[PDB]
Amino acid sequence: XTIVALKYPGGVVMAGDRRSTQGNMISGRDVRKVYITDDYTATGIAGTAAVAVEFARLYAVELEHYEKLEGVPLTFAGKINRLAIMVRGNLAAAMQGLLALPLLAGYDIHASDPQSAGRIVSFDAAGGWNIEEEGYQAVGSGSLFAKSSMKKLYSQVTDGDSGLRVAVEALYDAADDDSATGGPDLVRGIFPTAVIIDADGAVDVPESRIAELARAIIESRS
């Protein structure tokens, strides 16, 4: 599985593949790994459909819990801390094999510069966080391939459209070199999911828009 995230001028985009494996066997082809967690954030977890939907569900509950109790949303630093705590609280279960590494994408509505208000935060085994200053990041079994792809393609990111294209291509490159990451299935019509976040909030990118970009990448390579 591979999850990518990148900053574009005015926002951030996060995308993830749809595969699930039980060793060598493909156990799922429709898995959703990227979820909108509140109006300005999205989390992607490299793993099973449930440990991705249950982690995102709990974090979403935690964030909205604070908002209702206090009247205002948590600060982005606050959102990071809460996620870090959740991951750290799963360290005892991560020594068995139940590892879940999240990637957080968000837009800081309180940032000075709206152009660079997109945020990408990655977490390690211990529950340690790092706010990425390089522009892009990826987690999962195909992350090295996706990061190396974005390294060559990032200069082409100028807006939301080009950013989403680079994200989909990175995920394509991940699936091309990693069997645990699923590429776009033109036969069944299953494509990577994506979330785009700007000053107007977090929006699920429609399947049709990704399908158009997938076909363009395929047609560009043959």
């Binding site: 604070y66 206090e70 948590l74 600060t75 630093a77 606050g78 801390n81 809460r82 705590i85």
Partner: protein, 212 residues
């Protein structure tokens, strides 16, 4: 109310007996002025980055509350974030604590509290002042809070001498004057907005004489 009028009575008399404190909003933030003789016992204190505390009444009781508020604020900042600790939050928790105390404790706490908050560095927001009383009643005040001793002469001397964006030197004189109506013997502090993180600053000795 055969036990409440008493429990409340005991507290009010105690508050009445005590000395006076004044908290007012000015141009650079919030100014705390209290009548305090002691060199080392303080009635005015820092709660968090932008939040201040002032109290009137029995020392051991309001110091217990001061400590509990710092305990609360530090725990909250750690769990979430610092920017997330607000004066409203602290006023709310003092209201809930005082109320419980004035319900199931052996005797009610003889205190009157003021929680004040200024804006974060480079932010534009009008200062907030909250008055929390012995029974947990919470009051929100736009301009100023007066606590302890004979409150009415001081409150009336202030309502006549109050301006929106007074200077530090001006607001200090307006406060000292109000206190008489209602360095040593004086505890003075400010929540300084221009400070990057910790607003609280104590105005002591030579620096206090120099402005008047």
């Amino acid at each position: 109310e055969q036990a409440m009028r008493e429990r409340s009575e005991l507290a009010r008399k105690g508050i009445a007996r005590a000395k006076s404190v004044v908290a007012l909003a000015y141009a650079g933030g919030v100014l705390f002025v209290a009548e305090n003789p002691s060199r080392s016992l303080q009635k005015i204190s820092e709660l968090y980055d932008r939040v201040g505390f002032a109290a009137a009444g029995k020392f051991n009781e309001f110091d217990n509350l001061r400590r509990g508020g710092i305990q609360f604020a530090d725990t909250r900042g750690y769990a979430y974030d610092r920017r997330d600790v607000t004066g409203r939050q602290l006023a709310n928790v003092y209201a809930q604590t005082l109320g419980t105390i004035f319900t199931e404790q052996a005797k009610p706490y003889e205190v009157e509290l003021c929680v004040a908050e200024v804006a974060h560095y480079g932010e534009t927001k009008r200062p907030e002042l909250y008055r929390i009383t012995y029974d947990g009643s919470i009051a929100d005040e736009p301009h100023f809070v007066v606590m302890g001793g004979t409150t009415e002469p001081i409150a009336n001397a202030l309502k006549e001498s109050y301006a929106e964006n007074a200077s530090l030197t001006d607001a200090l004189r307006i406060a000292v004057a109000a206190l008489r109506a209602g360095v040593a013997s004086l505890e003075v502090a400010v929540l300084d907005a221009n400070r990057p993180r910790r607003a609280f600053r104590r105005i002591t000795g030579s620096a206090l004489q120099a402005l008047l």
